[PDB]
Every structure is written in structure tokens, then in C-alpha cells.
Amino acid sequence: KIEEGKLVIWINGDKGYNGLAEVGKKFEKDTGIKVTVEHPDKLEEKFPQVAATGDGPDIIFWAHDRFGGYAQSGLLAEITPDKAFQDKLYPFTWDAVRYNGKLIAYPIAVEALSLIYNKDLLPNPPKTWEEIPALDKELKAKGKSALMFNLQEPYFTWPLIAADGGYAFKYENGKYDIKDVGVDNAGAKAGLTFLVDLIKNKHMNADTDYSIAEAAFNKGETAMTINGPWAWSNIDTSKVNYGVTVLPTFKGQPSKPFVGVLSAGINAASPNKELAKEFLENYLLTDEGLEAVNKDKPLGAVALKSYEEELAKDPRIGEIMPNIPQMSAFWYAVRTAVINAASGRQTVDEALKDAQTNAAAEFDQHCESLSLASNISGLQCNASVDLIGTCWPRSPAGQLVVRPCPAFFYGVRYNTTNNGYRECLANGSWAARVNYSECQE
Amino acid sequence: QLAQQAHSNRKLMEII
Ligand SMILES: OC[C@H]1O[C@H](O[C@H]2[C@H](O)[C@@H](O)[C@@H](O)O[C@@H]2CO)[C@H](O)[C@@H](O)[C@@H]1O
Ligand SMILES: [Ca+2]
Secondary structure, three states, X not given: OOOOOOEEEEOOXXXXXXXXXXXXXXXXXXXXXXXXXXXXXXXXXXXXXXXOOOOOOOEEEEEHHHHHHHXXXXXXXXXXXXXXXXXXXXHHHHHHOEEOOEEOOEEEEEEOXXXXXXXXXXXXXXXXHHHHHHHHHHHHOOOOEEEOOOOOOHHHHHHHHHHOOOEEEEEEOOEEEEEEEEOOOHHHHXXXXXXXXXXXXXXXXXXXXXXXXHHHHHOOOEEEEEEOHHHHHHHHHHOOOEEEEOOOEEOOEOOOOEEEEEEXXXXXXXXXXXXXXXXXXXXXXXXXXXXXXXXXOOOOEEOEHHHHHHHOOOOOOOEEOOOOOOHHHHHHHHHHHHHHHHOOOOOHHHHHHHHHHHHOOOOOHHHHHOOOOOOOOOOEEOOEEOOOOOEEOOEEOOEEEEEEOOOEOOOOEXXXXXXXXXXXXXXXXXXOOOEOOOOOO | XXXXXXXXXXXXXXXX
């Protein structure tokens, strides 16, 4: 259970959590309420695990794309800012945290990946991806490399995959079409083929993660990286002379990074909702609060109008992501495809074919048709194919179901006069196990 | 090999 009368906040460790903690310390001094800021690894997966039990933080910070899934699980409280507060943030930031009519988070910052480059190694950064192989060749003769970035997280390769035509879900009839997935079209194939080719030709290493790339850039070993504004603070420190610019073009088409709105959701099981609202609206979402965070690690662009007007003067300072529940399937699909293509485990074609399936994993067909004369009232188990390939028909909850034994199983004859048995449970889920004992060899 | 393929199928059906 969550402790009443304090605030526990979770934010990713790459964000300005020390700056956030200072806003927390001021809130503590003014209220006598302890604020604890924590930053567990993989928070975006840990949050729903812990929260569905009524545990977790009072406030969770992530990019808005995760929030639709959280809200559908009932994990997030609906937020209640007055029209006057709403007016202080840009309309489009509110749009990103609106799910099925309701505001489900406060928008904080607008996050976009950029090309970060070392001005000493590369006074003019490339305008195209296509010139990077030649540039790497020149740099290798000097014991440097052109480009290193995180290949383990699909957020960083997506801009190139999307450039020539890849997309997540198509916006059709005023809503994202979850059946229309674009991870396996010509443009997605072309983008990923380029990336694999960079690796095949030793211009990049498949195993490059966040830390190899950040260290490589900051030690002056690579001329370019790809990252968000939060990363600038670490470069500042390193005293590499760096510039920030737009991602290069692929086949003459701009790179297309997926844009995130860092947002702050309130845990539906928190007994501290009015405290969390007060902290967010009156302490964090002020010029002074956002400045405190920005000073730790840059936010880039922010949702708050008054502070964005100051920030827009920064020279260092692409589509908004959907917030739909299917975004986690999408990211998981692309992650897997990229890692498999980059490591040679699959071809680009194979990888992206699997990605299309996995991104649309919520949607087999033949089994549903083979028993559509049923009309059952109340709880039912849906048509389902088991691991052996046996089709279990739509059945009432609380009933044992009987289907013949498969004619063939791994190229093996079985007598179809025998049956297998499966219980459709009282709650409308299939029993995990099927009794196949009777299907004699 | 087929009788072994059968004994190996048994173990599978027994789990599933
Ligand atoms: O890589 C897939 C991943 O991308 C995005 O996560 C970003 C996040 O938005 C940024 O705040 C930053 O911290 O880096 C993350 C990637 O390392 C999506 O928001 C996320 O759902 C997705 O899984
Ligand atoms: Ca992490």
C-alpha cells in the first residue's frame, strides 16, 4: 500500500531527477511533506507491474506513448486542472495526454532526438545518411569513427526507418488504425537495410548500447551521436566542442523521429492525489521549477508557455507518438526486428515480417469461423488454437470441452476417434492445460 | 527413431 502524507516520484535516470528533487525539497520546506524522487531502471515496465497491486509511486514520469496502456489498466487517476491552468500549456501537449476523452497526465517537456556532433572532428555535419560511410572511412584513417548511437533501443533507429515511409499506425478516419501497421513496407525495409549495411561494412557495431555510444562521443572518439536534450548536460561536462542539428536525410527525405511528451501521471491507488496535483501544478509547472530541472539535465522544449518563451532562444533548442495501448507491442516488435537484423540472426525482410505480426499481435482466423453457430449468454472462452494446433471453439464458461485428436502431430498419425479435453473455466478463460492422454500412437 | 519420436511426443502432449 502507498504511504499517506508523502510523495514518491519515479522518473527515468537519464532525466534531471536531482533538479526535480530540489523542487521536491522546496515543497517539503513549505508543506512538511517528504518528497522522494526515485529512478528505477526499466521504470516504464516496472510501473504497471507494481501499480496493478496498489503499490508504486504517487507520480510517474514517462513519455506519453506509454500512458494510454496505463490508463486502460485503470492505473492512472484522471487529472483535474482548471481551464486557467490548462491555458498555460500548449494545446498540442494536452492532446498527447488525452485518452478516451480524459486527461490522464500533466505534460512537462517535448522531447525530440537530434544529431549531436563534435565540431573539432566534423566542422560541417553531413546533410544525408548516404555520406556517412565515406566520412567514416576518412575518420578511421585517423583512428576515429563517424557515428555511434544506441542500437539496442528502437527509439534511436526509428527516425531512419520512418524517413522513406515506415510508420507505426496509420491515422485513418480520425483515429489510429491498429490493423494498418507500417513497419514492413518499402521505406521501412530501405531504412533498416541501410543500417544493416553500415554494420556489415564495419561503420557501426551491432552491440553498441547507450553507454558505449555516450562514452565514445564524450571521449572524442566518434564525430556524431543521436540523442535527446537530456544528454547535452553530460557533453557540457566533457568539454568536447559539440553542436546540435537536425538528423540527416535518407533518400532525400527528412529523418522522422517519434516525438515524446514527457508527462507526469498520478497513480490511481495513491491516497495523495491532491498533494500530487499541488506539487505538479504549483511547484513543478512554474518557470522556477522547470528551470531547476532544466539546469540538471536539459528538457529541450517545454509544455509551459511562459518558460518555453525563454528556452526558444537556445540555438540547440518528426511526429508526436500515439498514446494508444498498442504502442508497447509496436516498440517491442521494432526492438526485436532491429536487434535481429543488426546481428545477422534474420534478414531485414524476415525481421520486419515478424515485426508486422508482433506489432499487430492483438489480432487464429480459421478457428473462430469453425463454430459461429453458437449463441451463448454470459461468460465464454473465445475460439483459440492451442500449442499443438488443435482448435478450441467458442465455449460457455464452466464446461468441459471435447475435440478430436489431431490427424497428424509433427508428421505423426493419430486416431481421430479418440478425443482431447479442455476445461473452459468458470471465469471464461481456458484452462492452461489440455488432456491429450487418450490420443494413442 | 519413430518410436523415439513417439516417446518424445508423449512428453510434449503431457505438458501441453
Ligand atoms: O526505444 C523504445 C522506447 O522509446 C521511447 O522511450 C524513450 C523515452 O521516450 C525517452 O524519455 C528516453 O528516456 O529514452 C527512451 C528510449 O531509451 C518510448 O517512450 C518507449 O515507450 C519505448 O519503449
Ligand atoms: Ca534504463
